[PDB]
Design a protein around this nucleic acid. Structure first.
Length: 61
DNA sequence: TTTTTTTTTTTTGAGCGACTGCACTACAACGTTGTAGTGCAGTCGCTCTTTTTT
């Protein structure tokens, strides 16, 4: 549960950044699809990133 | 004085302060070895209000 909460914290930190760094969610291409980040679309993005971005960190050294 | 065209994004926080690991000597227990304090280095939280006057 601790890693499942820290991953949600990192996802909310990288999607919507602080008041000094522009986050990834502040973009004209993501606001057209959804206006508010629902947890269902968040889990869909998590599943797609686990399906595709896994060999990025699997072969990293 | 006449006239020619062209579709590609990129970037952005760092100093303050603590936690822990590794080393190194000072000093007491058993010349050598275990306990304690300090310093250097890598890693990690955090954080930067409030508003209205013709």
């Amino acid at each position: 549960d601790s890693t499942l909460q820290k991953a949600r914290t990192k996802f909310l930190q990288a999607y919507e950044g602080n008041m000094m760094v522009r986050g990834e969610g502040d973009d004209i291409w993501y606001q057209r699809l959804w206006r508010q980040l629902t947890p269902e679309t968040m889990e869909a993005i998590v599943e797609q990133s686990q399906r595709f971005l896994l060999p990025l960190f699997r072969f990293n050294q």
